[PDB]
Amino acid sequence: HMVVKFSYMWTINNFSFCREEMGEVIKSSTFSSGANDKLKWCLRVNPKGLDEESKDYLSLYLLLVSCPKSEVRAKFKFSILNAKGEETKAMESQRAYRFVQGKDWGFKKFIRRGFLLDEANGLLPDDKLTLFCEVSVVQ
């Protein structure tokens, strides 16, 4: 089946200053395809994981904030833009997932904190975490 494909670049400034504890969430602004499909999406990150078993990781999800019909099927890909402006450390759905309004899908163990937070690895230029999300909605 064909798709409508779109993207959002989320810059989280002053990332080293995040005070989020395990289970606390930051949501992005809402975004859409611009195809007037009435779908609104956002990203959400847990800097210290969804739960105790994931507290060593950032957990990253795509949330369907509002939709007109009962269900949407969509593939998704998340990557980090490094200091050289290139995509790295990407994770992508192996198939389309079924979203309804208020449902998310993503990666509970998206990136290990001990790796991300070491500035020498080039993922927090200017103390900014920049995430790039591509969404493909199945038509």
Partner: peptide
């Protein structure tokens, strides 16, 4: 390889 999941 990681698999996708939902927070709910």
């Amino acid at each position: 390889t990681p698999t996708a999941s939902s927070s709910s």
